[PDB]
Structures are given as C-alpha cells and as structure tokens.
Symmetry: D3
Subunit: 244 residues, 6 copies
C-alpha cells in the first residue's frame, strides 16, 4: 500500500473540510506519498516518545489525532528539532486527522453518542463538535456505562438532581472551559467531557449543569481505539498502537 | 397613486429595520418620488433582461427582491452602466425589499412555513431568517408537497432515515452554505433550501442533516408570487411579473 | 464585620468570573477593605441621589447592582466628581455585583424563574443571562403573577395567541433590544423583560414572539429584594435599601 | 480620433500607478471606448454645472482633475442621479487623472516649481505630492510671482522673518491640513498651497512656518491650463475649458 | 483671580489643540471653575507627593506638565484613590498643559532651541515635537552650555567626531527610545534628550548618532522654569513650585 | 571554537536588536550550540544548492544573510523538507544575521557608504536601512567606482542630469520598489540599489531621481565579502564562501 492509498481511505472516512477553522490537519511531515508502507502506527499525540517508539518499531506511516504543531514556526531547535530529525532521517510520514476525525460520521464524538445510545443525537456546537441527545435510562445507568467503557473513576459535579431520560451532551477531549459550560448549560442536563477546573466546577454548580469529567485522555482513546479496529478491519497493513 | 405611497405600503408590510446588517434595501435608483406610477413591475432580480423588459412593458416602478448592487462602486462601466442607463433614460424608479421581505410576517420564509403547515414555527437564525417547526407528516408527504408546490425534482441528500413528525427547517434562497449547514444540523432533521455546494453536501451527510435543494430561484419565487397576489389585492394599479 | 468579609460573602454567592465579558464588577471606590462596617446600603444604581442618601443615612458600605461607570475616564468633572467627593470624603465603600448577580444560582434571573415556577429551566443566552423553561399554566395566570409580584400594568405585545404550558423566557433588566428579541424568538413563546423600543415592538410582532415589558426597574428590583433578604438572614449587619 | 487613444495618450503623460493609494483615477463613467470623439471638454471637477455645460456644448469626452466619486455608493439618487443621468443619455465619457496628474513630470506640482524657478526641486511628501526647493531671490519677488501668475490677492501668515534664498515648498490644491502644516514645517521656510483653517493658521505661526494661502482653485487651475495647452497643442480635436 | 481665567490665560499661550493625538490635557480634577484662586502651584508631575505638598502649602490651583492619568480607568483604589481624595476634600483644581506646552512657541522645546541659539530651528517630529537646527559652535561649547544650564553630569554617547557647526536636535522629556533614535539619526549629528535605555545606547553607537542623555527631569524642568516666571510676570498671584 | 562563541561574536558585531520589525534573525536550524566548529560556511541564501554544497564540503556551521523562512509554517513537505533533512542528518547549524547585518556599523550598507566615500553619511530609512550622503565627485566617477567594485554593467535610469557633489543613496539589496522610490526621491539625487521593476523605472523618471540598478546579488555580496574577511581576520577556523 502506497502512502497515498491510506491517506485517501482516512480522508474518505474523515473529510478535511469537516475540520474547524485553523486546525492543522492532513500531512504534517513527508516528501514522498508514493512510498510503500509496511507498518502503520497510531497515537493520540506525536510526542517525542511516540516518535521514538515509532522508529524503534519500524513504523513508516505515523498517524496521530493531534497535529505536530498548532501554531506555525520558522525556527527549528529544541523539541521540535528532535521530532523532525527522527521523522526525516527515517523517512517516516506523519499524517493527522484532528477535528475532522471528531466531527465526521461515526467519528470520535459519534462513538460516544453511540456508546450511550443517545436518542436522536445532534451536533452540540456551531463548528460540528460534540453530540447531544436524550439518554433513555437513569442517571446511574449512565454513570455505570461511563465507568465501564470510558473511565472507571470520573469526578462528578452533581449540580442538580437528574431525572430519567435527560439530555446528554458529550464532547470527546477538552470540553469543559467556562465558555463551553455556559453554552452547554442551555442545551443539556448532563455534560460528559474532560478537564474540569475549579472555576468551571463552580460555574457548572451555579447554572445547574451536571458535569462528568472523564478526562481528555479517556474520551479520546475510546474513539481512537475504534478507529483502530476500523483501520484494522479494512486494511491489509500491520497496524499497531503507540499511545494506548 | 404616487411612488412614495407604494413604497410606504411595502415598507409597512416589510419594515426596513427588519433587514439584516448590511443589506442594501430601499430605493435603489430613483429621483422623483411624487411621480405618478402607471405600471408596477415586480421581479426577483434586477438583471439586464428585467431592466430591458421593464423598458419594453412601460414599467415605471420596478420592485426587486435582490438589490441592484451588494457592494458599492465608484466607477460606472460594463453591465452596470447599461442598467443605470435604461433606468435613468426612461426615468424608471428601482426599489428593493430584500431580507426584510424574507423576515416579515407572511414574508418569503413564512410563505414556506405556511406551505408545509409547520407546527409551532420559529425563526431559524439569530438574524431572523428561516423558519423551523414540526412537519406533521411523513418525510414522503413533505417530498410530495415540495415537488408539487416548489420544484419538481429537488436534489435530496437523504443523510439518514426520517421518522414521521420530524423537525423541518426552511430557508428561502441560498441557504446551503457550510456555516449554515452545521448550525441547522443542531436544530432540525430536514432542511429545505436552495443552492447546495459540494462542501455543504459533505457536512450534511457527515452531520446527519437530511438536505433538500430546490434552488434559490424556486424557493424564493414561491413567496414572491404570494407577495404579488398580495399587492394586486390591496393596490389599484397594473402589476406585472417580469420574472415568473 | 470588616469590608473584606462582606465582599467575600457576596463573592461566594455571586462568583466574579460569572460576569459577562467587559462587566465592571467588584470594588468601584475604596482604599481600606480592612475597615469596620456598621451599616450596608443596597441600591440598584449608584446615582447621585443614592450616594447622597447613603451618606446622610450613615451607610459606610454601599452595594449597587450597576457599576458606577461602564466606560472608563481620565478626567474628573461634573457629576462623577460630585459622586466621588462624597464616597471619598466619607470613606464610604462602593462595590457592585452586576451580571454575576444576574447569573449566579438564585440570582436575579433565577429569582424570576422561580417566581414563575418554570419547568426544567435553563440559561437563555450563551453568557449565562436569562432563564427559559415551560410555564405550567395559562397566559392569563402568567400575567396575573406578573401584575401581582413584578409590575401592576405591564405592557404586552400579543403578537400571537398563547396556548397553555408555553415556553417562557425571562431576563431581568434591559432585555428587549432588537438583537435580543430576534434571538429569544427562536427559543421562547413569550419573553418577559424590560424596556421596549418601538422597533423592538414591531420586530417582535413580525416574528411571533409575545413580549411582556414589565420595566427594567421592576424586574431587577424584584430580585434585589430577594438578595437583600438573603443578606439580612446571613449577616449580623444593619442593611437598608436606598432604592426600593 | 478615438477615446482609448486619448486615454492612451493621457496615461502616457501621467501613468496611472503614479496616483496615491485609493485615489479614484481613470475611467469614471463610460460604455464604449471605440467611440470616435469630436469635442473634448476639461474642467477641475465634474460638478452638475460642468456636466450640463458639457452636454450643452456637445462635448463627448469630459476630462476632470477631481474624480466623480471619492468614496463609493450602491444607491443612486439626488445630485449623483442627475450627474449620471446627463452623462449616459448623451453617451458622454468621463475620465479622470487626479493625483497622477498632480505628480507626473510637469504635473500641477512641477508647474508650480517650474514657474517659481526652484533650485534642485524634489517631491515634498512620501506619496509623490508637492515640490520643495530653494527660491533664488527674495520673499517679495516671490509674493509678486504669485499675485501676478497665481492668485492676485493671497493671504499671508508671516510667522517668521524670511531671508533671501529660502526653502519654498509648493503643493497644488488642498494642502493646508493641520498635519500637512506640521510636516512641511520640518522641511521648509515657506509653504505655498490652499485653504487655511484658522487652526492650521495658528499652528503654522506657532511652529514658525510661513504660509501663503493662494486657494485651491488658483493653484490647481494654473497647472491645468498648461495641461490644457499641452493637450490642444499635441492633438488635433478641439478642446475647451468648462471651469476656467 | 478666578480659575477659569487662569485656564483662559494658559490656553492663550498654549492652545489645547496644539497637543498631539490622544494627549490628556486640560482640566484633570475640577468642579467649580469660578472658584476664586489664591495660591497657584506649578509641578512637573501630579505625584501623591506633590499633591500632599499642595494641600500643605494651601494651593488651590495645581498646574502640572504631565497629566494625572494617561490611560482611562473605572475603578478607584490604591494610589489614584489617594490623589483624588486630597484633591477633592480641599477642592483643589488640577489642570495640565502637556504636549501643548511642549509644542508651542517658547514652549519646552523652543526653550532648549534658544539656550543653544540654534540656527533656523525647525520642528523635529511629524507630530510637532522637538527642535532641530545648526549649532553655531563646537561640540565642546555645546556640551559646556549643557552642563551649566540643563544638567551637570550628562551621559554622552559619542562614537565619532562631531565637527563644528553641526545639526543639533533637541527633545524635551523622553526622546531616547529606540525608534526615535533611528529616526533622529537620519536628521541630526547630535541629539539632546532624556533617558537612555541600554538598547538605545547600542543603537546610537551603531548608527553614528551622538546622544547626550540629560535626564527627562532636567530637559523638561528647564522650560517649565521659563514658564513659572512668564506666568509670574503676568498675574497678580502667589505662584510657587512644588517640584523645583 | 564552540558554535555559541561564533554566534556571540557575530552578534557583538551585528547585535540582534538592530533588525527591523519581524525579521527572522538568529539561530535558524540547530540543536546543540556547544557543538565544536571545524568549518564555517557563508552564503547569501540558504538555497537548496547551498545547503548541498555545505554538506558536500563538510560545513558544520552555515551562516546566511537571508533567513531560511520569512513566513512561519506548520507542515513539512517539498523543498523545505529537503533543506531541513540535510541540515539535520548532517547536524549542520544554520544561522543568520539579516537586517542587523545591513544596519550594524560597518555592515552591508556602511560598506557601500565606505566604498563611495560619502560625506557625513546617515541612515536613509526610519528602520535603520540604507545610507545617504554627499558624493564629493562627479557622476561618471560614481559610475566607474560602481562598475569596478560592485557590478560591471549596471542598468541606469538617467532621469535628470547630475551635478558633481550630489547626494547619493545606497541600499544593499532590494530597494527599487515604488514606495521606496518615492521616499528616496525626497532625499537624494542618485539612488543605488537592486531589482528595478519597469513600474519603478517610470516612477523615478517622472519624479526625477537617478536610479542605478546593480542587482541585489552584487550590492549585498560586496559587503558580504567584507564581512567574510572580517571573520577570517578575527577568527580561527576555515571560512569558505558558498555563493561567491
């Protein structure tokens, strides 16, 4: 399989114009997309560890959820230097599907919507992120589900009592900034995401929004793992995981 | 019946303050507002054709939905020369009611809402455009109405199954732009508008918003026809459609 | 009770970061928060009257809902001079909790929501302001409550008939601007707030949104009285109202 | 002789790209450039008076220094309706050379310099406007050369004692701006231009710049006449002034 | 005499509209422009120290060169609280002439350009600040003038030889920022101003501009001193200085 | 010789804070600055050719005048990928002094001022770039000094005839863009720089400035050669040239 083969498959599943404004998705590093690919590695972050592990395990196509750089640079030293050296020396391709993999059909968010069997889900945000629907069940049933498949000990901000069949909002990753709490407060009863700060915790309690912090890692990995199966089940490649 | 009176009647049906920020509504071309109006001509667009047919039919007050120019200019050459030429040579007044007609009670958007008999309809966008409510029927009957009343073969992106009594958003004109689509996907099961783009279609299929494109023309001309009947009913003068 | 204790007590109830962007909340005028406080006066507005009255009453901590200044200055002349001269000459502390008091749990907006016993209420705006939920009753029952507890002769714009159990939006203060109304029109059947312009009236009529103008004063002062009681029930302090 | 060739010729004398930023130079109103021209009028501005006179005289190419519209418009009524009316019914072409004609070799600004017999003259402003140099002579011969050839009675601000052989900056048209004074005060002893607000006057005195206000009309038409003579001489077809 | 006349006098020498863009000139803290004035004070800076001294000396009109605030504020605490409390308890008026006093004839910049008898002294910057002219002498003479009148031990940055009869630029106050140094370097050989940052020194050595740091206090208080006398020689007023 | 010592040397000569706003100077690609340097290579440009010759001729420190990237990037493919690879497999350090090397004492502009022996030469622009001064000589003398040392067959725009002892302006590199041409024409009789656009030609002609285009290669390489010898004189290690 050529590099371009894989990239085409991915991009058909997670088209690039799904990506929110400014998101650095697609080819991060690479000079030849005709190159044949023996091993594909999959990670959350293109960290220095992941890059080294990739080269050690002989990965020649490195796919990561996060991009190598959010903000552009024009000077190459420190960590970024090291990351680039390895990738280029070993001719490893780094390719990224960030928000487009979150937003796409059956993507990271839909995976959470599907997990909780959300009735009539809709996107949560103006930019396509997150899903929101009714959870046909009790709050504790929802809690169990979170504990069983997402993250075993989630911090809960019980801001209000929660009736059966409540509106569940889910966002894979970092979804618990203040602006996001305030926004989702209009649209839901419970908000399942990751990275609750004290300020945001107070805010949630003030507006009556029930937050469950399953952390950014766990919600991402859950979707990413199913993307691995999808990758595995549809491609001949040896595919391994480096972050999970 | 003077021109200013006709203007006052229309401005009473659709007040100018209803217009979205920026819209160029009102007196487009014209100097003598006391001038007695003999034949009123109504068209969707003040194209070079319409402005010629106005000259041919002795139209001396020309109403359009679309304004003459979106963006100002300070040089007069090309088509716009020709347009202003035919208009000032024959002292034909040109007047437009644009998004104010899209937004007012029983305007172009209400026209659509009324046609599908939307249960508890409400404005779709923050600026007052579009309507959204429950369609008390099958997706099928919605299709039937659309075909029967608006456009005979709409392109349809059946992004997922549509259960009976679905939420239908409607927008007359060019409503199928990427920004629109993601926003409407939060609020509706089915979106009826015109002018689907490739990028727009993909967002829709991915987000699960079923989209129905019946062109900017067909969706606008429906409400515009009702507007003509409305003018003919309340105003004693001949009114021709130059455009439908 | 020291100044800084009262402030802590107020800020624990109405956390500052709740405030909307740009809001001038907190300490308005003061130098020694360690000082001792005998008499706390509470007002809507830090008007010249309120400040004049404050001093003659021996109020040494003056709380207001509105900040002393929305827009900053670098010159001290006329009215603002006269206000500061008093506050300073008498070392009277001036401190506001504005939209943070509008937004917090059991704040000015939650008060109204509870007055009307809204069913499953949620915030109205992206920034925490307003509450919206179902009013389990008839429109008439709803007006009688408005008349009894808020303002005896509210102006009503009956743009549409209102069925029982309608969706009711409430916004304490100045919530009846053209942009506000366009927005709430998407989300409510009836909008209860204060201060209607003629354009806002017409716009509400075109969109189908029934507006009840109960004045900005009446909708704010209802909640402040609740806040005053709460303060009285919690502080061993003399608290008087300068404004109501 | 055709329109384009007249234009081709004028752009020869004054290249369009010489013009300052955002200055509206070139074709103002015109349909067709293969139109054989008969009479060519010129004037400073395309006022209504100039434009009626141009039609009256059967002028079919109207050259103006000042362009028709500075800032652009998308509505056509009032004075601009009238102007655009006359030019289009009588197929009259309107062309402008504004700052390019102020700037080019032997432009209106060189004209003031050439006439004033200046020592080693150079551009006065960053954008190519004005000329500055030494006047071999006295103040008095200078006032005289002005009264006789420019404006028979100028207003003099005698900020400073002026000595023979001085720095004389000249600027054709409006150039007594409060900031044009501040700047020209660095770079000359005497400023010669047009239209002195009492503010500009007081400033120039305060800084020691000697200003001589010969109005905008006088100093602009001086150059224009030469351009007129430069025009009639080098081309066959007849050429009148409509403004001087 | 009365406050509003003192102010009318100061604005007779120094128009407020002479001051550069955005400068906070005029009344700083004042309510009663018809207050009879007994004891005028002049200071460079309205520090808390000066303001205390004004109340202790019984000053009832405080004139400073620098404004009380450059940036507008809407809260009042700490230092500004203190300055205001004293200025308002004692009803002391604070008025300021800033760059208007720097720019006027015989202002703070002309003061320097006369100490050094500069020949043909012109404005330095585009905003009217500063004076530049040929110094009819030797660098040595220049520097001895500087040490006697302005400031005794000025830091000199001299990277090359100043000839005789050179371009001297003077700026009262702070004129030794980087970008100004780059700019005076195209226009003078020597540059007398205040406050040299290290980065600025380096820049001056590199570009060949000879810089004399005379402190900002000294280069200002020189011309302030001509003022205090000019003011004393024209008013029946007790006039004392609180900063010199 | 450690890399940091080499760097600290260059920066002593041409300090970093000398560079114009936004100029990407300093370390460009490099991990280890303690690295020992056996062979320094210098070039005008970090072109792909140059980076290859550096690897070929065993260069372990590459100094360039021009930076590797002016505009930031966050994707690594194509040319930039190739440049980066060679520098990072081979651990070659890329470093640059750009406008700081044009602006520093005895930098690239001074070198030209040196070569033409300009009388009391000063910075041309506000940013520190360029040099202007009296050329105590004849024009044909100037031409010969130019043909001999800079570039053999200059392209010359003789717009006006030149007196001996004229003002000469030099700018190492790209300096013949229309905006520059207008500025310089205020300040100089002849302007010597590189890369003359046809639109810049006419502008100079019409403005009456003499322009001598000796390409940007030659004008920069002249002072680059002097800088190279300077390094040699003061430093061990072999210093080769890669562009000249």
């Amino acid at each position: 399989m050529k590099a371009k083969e894989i990239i085409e498959f991915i991009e058909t599943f997670a088209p690039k114009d799904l990506a929110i404004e400014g998101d650095n998705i697609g080819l991060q590093v690479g000079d030849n997309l005709d190159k044949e690919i023996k091993k594909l590695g999959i990670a959350l972050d293109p960290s220095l560890s992941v890059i080294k592990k990739a080269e050690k395990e002989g990965v020649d196509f490195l796919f990561t959820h996060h991009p190598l750089l959010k903000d552009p640079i024009r000077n190459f030293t420190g960590v970024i230097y090291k990351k680039l050296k390895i990738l280029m020396e070993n001719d490893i391709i780094l390719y990224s599907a960030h928000t487009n993999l979150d937003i796409c059909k059956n993507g990271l968010n839909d995976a959470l919507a599907e997990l909780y069997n959300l009735e009539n889900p809709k996107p949560l945000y103006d930019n396509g992120l997150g899903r929101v629907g009714i959870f046909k069940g009790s709050f504790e049933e929802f809690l169990e589900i979170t504990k069983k498949y997402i993250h075993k000990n989630p911090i809960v901000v019980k801001s209000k009592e929660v009736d059966d069949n409540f509106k569940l909002a889910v966002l894979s990753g970092y979804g618990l900034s203040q602006s996001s709490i305030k926004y989702v407060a209009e649209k839901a009863d419970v908000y399942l995401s990751g990275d609750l700060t004290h300020h945001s915790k107070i805010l949630a309690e003030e507006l009556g929004l029930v937050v469950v912090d399953a952390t950014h890692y766990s919600t991402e990995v859950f979707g990413l793992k199913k993307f691995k199966e999808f990758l595995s089940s549809n491609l001949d490649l040896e595919i391994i995981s480096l972050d999970f």
